[PDB]
UniProtKB/Swiss-Prot annotation, chain A:
Region (Disordered): 93-117
Keyword rRNA-binding (UniProt): yes
Keywords attached to this entry: Ribonucleoprotein, Ribosomal protein, RNA-binding, rRNA-binding, tRNA-binding
Source species of the chain: Escherichia coli (strain K12)
Name of the molecule in the record: Small ribosomal subunit protein uS13
Phenotype upon changing residue 104 to K: In PW097; partially suppresses a rimM deletion
Cellular component terms per the entry's GO annotation: cytoplasm; cytosol; cytosolic small ribosomal subunit; small ribosomal subunit
Swiss-Prot record, chain B:
An annotated Gene Ontology molecular function: structural constituent of ribosome
Chain's gene name: rpsS
Protein name: Small ribosomal subunit protein uS19
Listed GO CC annotations: cytoplasm; cytosol; cytosolic small ribosomal subunit
Biological function: In the E.coli 70S ribosome in the initiation state it has been modeled to contact the 23S rRNA of the 50S subunit forming part of bridge B1a; this bridge is broken in the model with bound EF-G. The 23S rRNA contact site in bridge B1a is modeled to differ in different ribosomal states, contacting alternately S13 or S19. In the 3.5 angstroms resolved ribosome structures the contacts between L5, S13 and S19 bridge B1b are different, confirming the dynamic nature of this interaction. Bridge B1a is not visible in the crystallized ribosomes due to 23S rRNA disorder.
PANTHER family: RIBOSOMAL PROTEIN S19P FAMILY MEMBER, SMALL RIBOSOMAL SUBUNIT PROTEIN US19M
From Swiss-Prot, chain D:
Key words of the record: Ribonucleoprotein, Ribosomal protein
Gene Ontology CC terms, in alphabetical order: cytoplasm; cytosolic small ribosomal subunit; small ribosomal subunit
Similarity comment: Belongs to the universal ribosomal protein uS14 family.
NCBIfam families given in the database record: PRK08881.1 (NF006477)
InterPro entries attached to this UniProt entry: Ribosomal_uS14 (IPR001209), Ribosomal_uS14_bac/plastid (IPR023036), Ribosomal_uS14_CS (IPR018271)
GO terms for biological process, alphabetical: cytoplasmic translation; ribosomal small subunit assembly; translation
Protein name per Swiss-Prot or TrEMBL: Small ribosomal subunit protein uS14
MF terms in GO: rRNA binding; structural constituent of ribosome; tRNA binding
Protein purpose: Binds 16S rRNA, required for the assembly of 30S particles and may also be responsible for determining the conformation of the 16S rRNA at the A site.
From Swiss-Prot, chain E:
Cofactor(s) the protein requires to work: Zn(2+)
Keywords: Acetylation, Metal-binding, Ribonucleoprotein, Ribosomal protein, RNA-binding, rRNA-binding, Zinc
TM regions (residue ranges): none
Subunit structure: Part of the 50S ribosomal subunit.
Reported modifications of this chain: Proteolytically cleaved by protease VII to yield a peptide lacking residues 63-70. It is not clear if this is due to protein degradation or is a bona fide processing event in the strain used in PubMed:339950 and PubMed:10556732. In strains B, D10, MRE-600 and Q13 the only protein seen in PubMed:10556732 was full-length; the last 7 amino acids were sequenced only for strain MRE-600.
Source species: Escherichia coli (strain K12)
Protein name according to UniProt: Large ribosomal subunit protein bL31
RNA sequence: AGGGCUACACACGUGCUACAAUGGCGCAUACAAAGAGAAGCGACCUCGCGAGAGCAAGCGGACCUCAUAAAGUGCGUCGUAGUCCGGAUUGGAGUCUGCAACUCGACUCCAUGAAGUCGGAAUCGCUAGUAAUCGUGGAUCAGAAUGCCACGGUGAAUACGU
C-alpha cells in the first residue's frame, strides 16, 4: 500500500511525511526515503508502486510504538522502580535531567498548583 | 544524558576499600567517603554504604549496578514532602 | 498435550518407583490448573472489568467465569454481589497442553513473584502462582490497554501433603524459583 | 579577613609545579584520550589523588596583595576594587581614565 | 468440550526451546528472578573504560600538550 | 573528605525564545569593525552524521590564527493547518574539559515532542546612526553566558501641544 503498512497518516510531500508516519524525524526522514530511492519532491499521492511498496518495507527497520515506545518506556519504568536518586526524581515528576527549581517545572509538570480546592 | 570519562572509569578510592574486601565477601558494609565512582561487576554482591554527605546508606550491588555512577543510585539531600509540608523526620 | 505425554511416558515411572508406590492413582498426578486475577474493584463504570477480560484473554481465550463479591464488608467496599476476580478452571487435556508453556518457560516474563517455592506451597500440596506479566501469544499488536499486573495461577494437584507437592512443582520439571 | 584561605592556595601553587609537573601531563596519552587499548593503565586515579592537592583544576587565582577571591585580572595580579585605586594613584604606567 | 469459546490455544505447536527454535530460553539460570538492567553490555564491554576517543594507530608511551602538537 | 551552596509548592524583579506568511523551509550569494593569542590561539592535512578526533604548518601578531559576519540578497519551497513555527521537556547513543560531570557541567546527535494563536488591571524605554533587529568579538575562564562589556550591519516612527 501507499501508506506505511504499520500505521496511518496522510497527505503532504514525502520529506515532511515520515514524522507523520511516525517515529522517525527529519534526519532519518530524508535519508531513509533517499536510500530507497524515493524523492522528497513528490506528493504522497502520485507515488509509483515500486517506491511505495518498498517504502512499506524500508520503514520496517524502524520504530513502532506497540513494543518500542513501551520498551523505551519500560527502561524508564525500571529506572522509576530501580532505586536511584536519578529515578526517584523521575517518580516525583519534577524536572530531573537538566534543571533545578526556583520556578521552572511547567514544561515537565504542566500547571502550577491550580484551582479553588 | 550527560556522559562519562573517556578513558577508565572505575574510581579507585572505593576500589581502595574494595581490594582487600572483594575476595573476602560478606561483612560490615563499606563506608564510603567516595561516592564519585561508577559501579561495575567487580563490586557485585557486596554492600557499599553510600555517603549522603553525613552518613552512609547501604547499597547492595547487583546487575542494575553495572550501569552507572554510584552516587546516581543514592540520595544526598532529604528532598522532603512535596511542597515543604510534613511533621516528621527520618534521620 | 506433550508435557502430559512426558508425564505419561517418562515421569509416571520415575515418580512411582522412586517413592515406592503401589497403584497408579496412589501415585502423584497433576490436576486442574485454575486462576484468579483480582481487580481493584470493577471501577464505577466497569472498566477494570474490561481489564479482567483482556488479561484472561491473554492465557485463556474464553470468557471469565467471573467471581462475585459475595459478602462485601471492609475497605474495598459495597455492592455485595457485583463482579470481581476472573477465574478459569481450565479444560482438561488442553489445560495440560497449556501447561507446556503455562508455568514452564514462562521465564522471559518472570521478574520474581511471591509464589513458586518448594517450601511455601500449602501444607495440603495446593499452590497459587501470581505471575504479574503476560506469557505472549505470537500474533499482531502489543497495545492491550494493558492492566500491567495480573493472574494468580492456582495449580491443583493429586496431592494431600508436602511430599506429593514437591514431587510436582520441583523435580517433575519445570523447576521452582531459584 | 581570613588570611588562612589565601594561605591554603599558596601551598597548592608551590606543589603544582614541584610534585606534580613531571607526573601531571601523563593523563592524556597513557590514561585519557590516547591510551585506548594501549594498556589503559587502570590504576591512574589512585596515583593522582594526592595530586588532587596540586592539579590546576584545584587552584585558582586570588589578588597578590590583598587576596580577594573574586574578579581577578590576570594582567595585573589584583582584583576589581583594589586595582582601580592603584590606577588612580598612577602606579601602573600608561593607564589613563578612559574616554572614547 | 463446549465447542463455542476459546479461539486459539496452541497453533505454533509450542516451539520454544533454547534461544533458537523460536523465541528464547537460555542457560540453567532460566528462572529469571530479577528485573532488567537496560544499561550493561556493550558500554561495559567486559571492560571498565567508558569510551575513550577515536582509534589511533600510534598510541605512544607517556604524556602530552594538546595545543602545541610538537 | 563528602554533602550543601544549585532543593521546590508557590508568589515577585530582570533577560531569553516564539507565537509566523513582511513570514518559516532548502540551496546558492554579498559587503563588517573592534578584540585576543607562547604552560596559548592553532590553519591545511586525513577521519567523523555532528561535536570532535588525530597529524602538523604557522603565529609571536596590520604577517599566522582564533575567523566564514549574520540578518540582507538571489531562486526554489510551505500555504495559516499549534504547522513545514516553536522547539522546552524526556529516552538512548555521542563528543568534550577535567582527580572527578551522580547529586551538579558544557556540548554534539537521533528519536519523540508540550505551552505559546499578540497577552487583564497595570506598566517601562525611547528625539537619530538613536529606536528595532541580525550577527561579531572579548573579560572573568581548567571547564561552563541565556548575562556583562564593547563592536559593526540593515536602519524607523514621531514630539501637534505643556
Amino acid at each position: 500500500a501507499r501508506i506505511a503498512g504499520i500505521n496511518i497518516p496522510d497527505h503532504k510531500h514525502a520529506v515532511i511525511a515520515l514524522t507523520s508516519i511516525y517515529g522517525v524525524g527529519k534526519t532519518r526522514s530524508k535519508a531513509i526515503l533517499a536510500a530507497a530511492g524515493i524523492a522528497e519532491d513528490v506528493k504522497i499521492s502520485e507515488l509509483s508502486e515500486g517506491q511505495i511498496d518498498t517504502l512499506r518495507d524500508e520503514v520496517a527497520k524502524f520504530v513502532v510504538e506497540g513494543d518500542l515506545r513501551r520498551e523505551i518506556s519500560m527502561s524508564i519504568k525500571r529506572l522509576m522502580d530501580l532505586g536511584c536518586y536519578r529515578g526517584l526524581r523521575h517518580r516525583r515528576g519534577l524536572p530531573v535531567r537538566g534543571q533545578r527549581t526556583k520556578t521552572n517545572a511547567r514544561t515537565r509538570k504542566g500547571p502550577r498548583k491550580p484551582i479553588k480546592k | 544524558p550527560r556522559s562519562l570519562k573517556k578513558g577508565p572509569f572505575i574510581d579507585l578510592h572505593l576500589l581502595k576499600k574494595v581490594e582487600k574486601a572483594v575476595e573476602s565477601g560478606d561483612k560490615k558494609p563499606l563506608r564510603t567517603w567516595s561516592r564519585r565512582s561508577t559501579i561495575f561487576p567487580n563490586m557485585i554482591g557486596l554492600t557499599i554504604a553510600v555517603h549522603n554527605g553525613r552518613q552512609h546508606v547501604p547499597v547492595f550491588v547487583t546487575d542494575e549496578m553495572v550501569g552507572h555512577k554510584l552516587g546516581e543510585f543514592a540520595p544526598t539531600r532529604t528532598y522532603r514532602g512535596h511542597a515543604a509540608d510534613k511533621k516528621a523526620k527520618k534521620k | 498435550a506433550k508435557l502430559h505425554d512426558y508425564y505419561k511416558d517418562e515421569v509416571v515411572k520415575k515418580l512411582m518407583t522412586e517413592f515406592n508406590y503401589n497403584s497408579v492413582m496412589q501415585v502423584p498426578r497433576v490436576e486442574k490448573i485454575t486462576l484468579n486475577m483480582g481487580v481493584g474493584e470493577a471501577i464505577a463504570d466497569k472498566k477494570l472489568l474490561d481489564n479482567a477480560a483482556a488479561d484472561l484473554a491473554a492465557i485463556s481465550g474464553q470468557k471469565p467465569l467471573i467471581t462475585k463479591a459475595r459478602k462485601s464488608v471492609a475497605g474495598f467496599k459495597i455492592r455485595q454481589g457485583y463482579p470481581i476476580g476472573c477465574k478459569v478452571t481450565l479444560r482438561g487435556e488442553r489445560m495440560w497442553e497449556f501447561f507446556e508453556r503455562l508455568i514452564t518457560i514462562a521465564v522471559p516474563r518472570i521478574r520474581d513473584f511471591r509464589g513458586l517455592s518448594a517450601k511455601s506451597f500449602d501444607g495440603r500440596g495446593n499452590y497459587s502462582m501470581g505471575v504479574r506479566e503476560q506469557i505472549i501469544f505470537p500474533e499482531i499488536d502489543y497495545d492491550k490497554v494493558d492492566r500491567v499486573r495480573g493472574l494468580d495461577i492456582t495449580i491443583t494437584t493429586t496431592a494431600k501433603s508436602d511430599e506429593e507437592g514437591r514431587a510436582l512443582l520441583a523435580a517433575f520439571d519445570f523447576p521452582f524459583r531459584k | 579577613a581570613k588570611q588562612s584561605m589565601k594561605a591554603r592556595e599558596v601551598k597548592r601553587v608551590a606543589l603544582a609545579d614541584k610534585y606534580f609537573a613531571k607526573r601531571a601531563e601523563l593523563k592524556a596519552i597513557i590514561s585519557d584520550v590516547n591510551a585506548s587499548d594501549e594498556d589503559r593503565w587502570n590504576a591512574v586515579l589512585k596515583l593522582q589523588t594526592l595530586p588532587r592537592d596540586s592539579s590546576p583544576s584545584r587552584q585558582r587565582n586570588r589578588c597578590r596583595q590583598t587576596g580577594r577571591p573574586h574578579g581577578f585580572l590576570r594582567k595585573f595580579g589584583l582584583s576589581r576594587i583594589k586595582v582601580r585605586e592603584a590606577a588612580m594613584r598612577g602606579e601602573i604606567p600608561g593607564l589613563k581614565k578612559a574616554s572614547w | 468440550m463446549k465447542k463455542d469459546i476459546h479461539p486459539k490455544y496452541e497453533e505454533i505447536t509450542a516451539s520454544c526451546s533454547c534461544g533458537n527454535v523460536m523465541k528464547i530460553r537460555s542457560t540453567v539460570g532460566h528462572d529469571l528472578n530479577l528485573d532488567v538492567c537496560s544499561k550493561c553490555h556493550p558500554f561495559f564491554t567486559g571492560k571498565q573504560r567508558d569510551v575513550a576517543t577515536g582509534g589511533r594507530v600510534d598510541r605512544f608511551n607517556k604524556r602530552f600538550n594538546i595545543p602545541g602538537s610538537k
